[PDB]
Amino acid sequence: RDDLQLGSSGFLQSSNYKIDISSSSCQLYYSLPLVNVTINNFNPSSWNRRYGFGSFNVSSYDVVYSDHCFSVNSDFCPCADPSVVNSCVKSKPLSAICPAGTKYRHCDLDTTLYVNNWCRCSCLPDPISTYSPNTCPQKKVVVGIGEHCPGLGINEEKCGTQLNHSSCSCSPDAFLGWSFDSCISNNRCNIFSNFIFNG
Amino acid sequence: CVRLYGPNFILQVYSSQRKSWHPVCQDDWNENYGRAACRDMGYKNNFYSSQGIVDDSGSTSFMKLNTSAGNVDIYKKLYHSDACSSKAVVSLRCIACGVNLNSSRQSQIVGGESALPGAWPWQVSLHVQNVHVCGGSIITPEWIVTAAHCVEKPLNNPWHWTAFAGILRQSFMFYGAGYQVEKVISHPNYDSKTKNNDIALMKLQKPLTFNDLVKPVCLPNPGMMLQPEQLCWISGWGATEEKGKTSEVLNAAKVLLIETQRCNSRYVYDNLITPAMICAGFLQGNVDSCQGDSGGPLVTSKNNIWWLIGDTSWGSGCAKAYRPGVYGNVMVFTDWIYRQMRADG
Numbered sequence: 001r002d003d004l005q006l007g008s009s010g011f012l013q014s015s016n017y018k019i020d021i022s023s024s025s026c027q028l029y030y031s032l033p034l035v036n037v038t039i040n041n042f043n044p045s046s047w048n049r050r051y052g053f054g055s056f057n058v059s060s061y062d063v064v065y066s067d068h069c070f071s072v073n074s075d076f077c078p079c080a081d082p083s084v085v086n087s088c089v090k091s092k093p094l095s096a097i098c099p100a101g102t103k104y105r106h107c108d109l110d111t112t113l114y115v116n117n118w119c120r121c122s123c124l125p126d127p128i129s130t131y132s133p134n135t136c137p138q139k140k141v142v143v144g145i146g147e148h149c150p151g152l153g154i155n156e157e158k159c160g161t162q163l164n165h166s167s168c169s170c171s172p173d174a175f176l177g178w179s180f181d182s183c184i185s186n187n188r189c190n191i192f193s194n195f196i197f198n199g
Numbered sequence: 200c201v202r203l204y205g206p207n208f209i210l211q212v213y214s215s216q217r218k219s220w221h222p223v224c225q226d227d228w229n230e231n232y233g234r235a236a237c238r239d240m241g242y243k244n245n246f247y248s249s250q251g252i253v254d255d256s257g258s259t260s261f262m263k264l265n266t267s268a269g270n271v272d273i274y275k276k277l278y279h280s281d282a283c284s285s286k287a288v289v290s291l292r293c294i295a296c297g298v299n300l301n302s303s304r305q306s307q308i309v310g311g312e313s314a315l316p317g318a319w320p321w322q323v324s325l326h327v328q329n330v331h332v333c334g335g336s337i338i339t340p341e342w343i344v345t346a347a348h349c350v351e352k353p354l355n356n357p358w359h360w361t362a363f364a365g366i367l368r369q370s371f372m373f374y375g376a377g378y379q380v381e382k383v384i385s386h387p388n389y390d391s392k393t394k395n396n397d398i399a400l401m402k403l404q405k406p407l408t409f410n411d412l413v414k415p416v417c418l419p420n421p422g423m424m425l426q427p428e429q430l431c432w433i434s435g436w437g438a439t440e441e442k443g444k445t446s447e448v449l450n451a452a453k454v455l456l457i458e459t460q461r462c463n464s465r466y467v468y469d470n471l472i473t474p475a476m477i478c479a480g481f482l483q484g485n486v487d488s489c490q491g492d493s494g495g496p497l498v499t500s501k502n503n504i505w506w507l508i509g510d511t512s513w514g515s516g517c518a519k520a521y522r523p524g525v526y527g528n529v530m531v532f533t534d535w536i537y538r539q540m541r542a543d544g
């Protein structure tokens with residue numbers, strides 16, 4: 001709750017909703033009786049519901065906020081290349097076939113001291129803490145004034161299978177970068193609400 | 200059993216009862232003990248200096264002199280004492296290693312300005328049949344270090360190992376313009392699978408000069424306490440991009456130290472890096488500096504003085520994602536060389 005001080009750092013003002021500190025806004029903090037309150041918890045990004053984001057499992061009254069908000073391009077595809085990956089032996093990842101136009105993930109079979117076809121792709125281990133930040137397509141961006149969080153981060157190594165390389169989907173454990181808590185305090189689900197008095 | 204140590208060069212002394220290295224207090228030491236002490240660790244006809252310094256090393260069992268007895272050796276006259284009688288201990292310099300002309304903008308690994316001459320005064324170049332192949336770094340006028348996998352089979356005899364120093368460019372090292380061969384020691388445990396011990400000393404017959412372009416680099420001391428993300432300065436004429444030949448001029452920009460647990464983890468190098476292998480570079484994308492020389496050294500600058508820490512070794516694809524360079528670990532065996540430099544004379 002203390003993220004919301006007017007002009008601050010933190011999680012909510014940086015990767016959920018950036019409270020603009022220039023206009024003639026006026027902030028309201030109110031309450032609501034929890035007889036009939038159904039928190040909608042929907043994901044706002046296109047390219048996570050395109051790769052099989054169904055929902056969160058939280059409780060009846062838990063609100064899913066965000067930690068980091070990574071942005072990808074339009075041709076993104078978080079599965080490896082299956083027509084390359086078969087000759088890999090070491091560190092061989094899962095893969096599938098991308099949808100049309102979505103360029104593949106860059107995976108190498110480069111050479112060890114003795115082993116010749118050992119797999120090494122990008123985005124390791126997870127894009128939260130990648131070792132080479134200048135090469136994973138999921139670029140970490142800070143959210144702006146009046147924008148949504150453009151997508152949860154995908155761990156690039158739980159997106160795929162081995163036998164049936166279908167259209168490239170992912171798996172529910174692989175979306176990372178969100179947590180929650182319960183809104184209910186004093187038997188009343190608290191709520192923030194902004195106002196903007198323009199013109 | 201005697202060795203240098205740390206930044207201020209204290210002689211440690213091993214005793215069989217105490218099982219431990221111990222310092223010597225400066226109670227009536229002499230150059231007739233001191234200038235005759237550099238041949239103990241492989242320095243015959245050289246010496247620089249000796250002074251008294253304050254004790255901070257960390258032993259509580261000192262070494263004293265048996266001057267009350269008559270004419271015996273140094274190595275007999277050393278008993279223990281709890282206090283230094285003048286509170287000055289061994290300070291030493293076995294050779295004029297160290298300084299260069301502190302210049303500014305030598306950065307010619309890719310995207311920079313050339314290595315200024317005399318500011319890297321240990322950089323050599325080694326040749327067979329007058330092609331530039333491997334590098335190294337000088338510690339005596341008669342000894343020279345390099346990576347062992349240059350001197351591997353079937354080129355393991357000394358008479359085809361022509362050193363050529365001095366000139367930044369690929370041309371001006373001519374026949375006679377550079378002293379030449381002698382003994383090729385090796386750490387005799389190089390392998391094909393590990394490249395553990397990829398460091399081989401070399402020797403020359405004709406002592407060169409400390410004039411301008413040539414000066415011996417400082418070999419490190421036993422237990423000199425690096426920093427886990429220290430800056431490191433490499434040098435060499437190596438090809439800045441792979442499937443090249445050689446860069447024309449001397450290139451001497453900077454790199455960093457990666458630790459073990461990043462390199463030796465699962466994604467960089469899956470548990471390969473031995474204790475006698477040090478990682479270096481930056482674990483990043485295409486920001487690394489390749490300049491492949493296989494011996495073109497790793498020189499750091501602790502105690503405001505240049506010291507040698509790593510000589511180069513193998514790697515992966517030239518300066519790209521996830522793949523740093525892995526360096527030979529030349530503080531591990533700085534005494535093996537000192538028992539392979541003792542008995543050349």
Ligand SMILES: *[C@@H]1O[C@H](CO)[C@@H](O)[C@H](O)[C@H]1NC(C)=O
Nearest residue numbers: 031032033034035036037038
């Ligand atoms: C909750 O819902 C019921 C029926 O949907 C409604 O009759 C009731 O008035 C609601 N609660 C409040 C406090 O209005």
Ligand SMILES: *[C@@H]1O[C@H](CO)[C@@H](O)[C@H](O)[C@H]1NC(C)=O
Nearest residue numbers: 054055056057058059172173
């Ligand atoms: C959340 O939902 C999934 C599927 O309904 C279930 O496997 C998981 O156990 C649930 N979480 C908890 C804490 O029970």
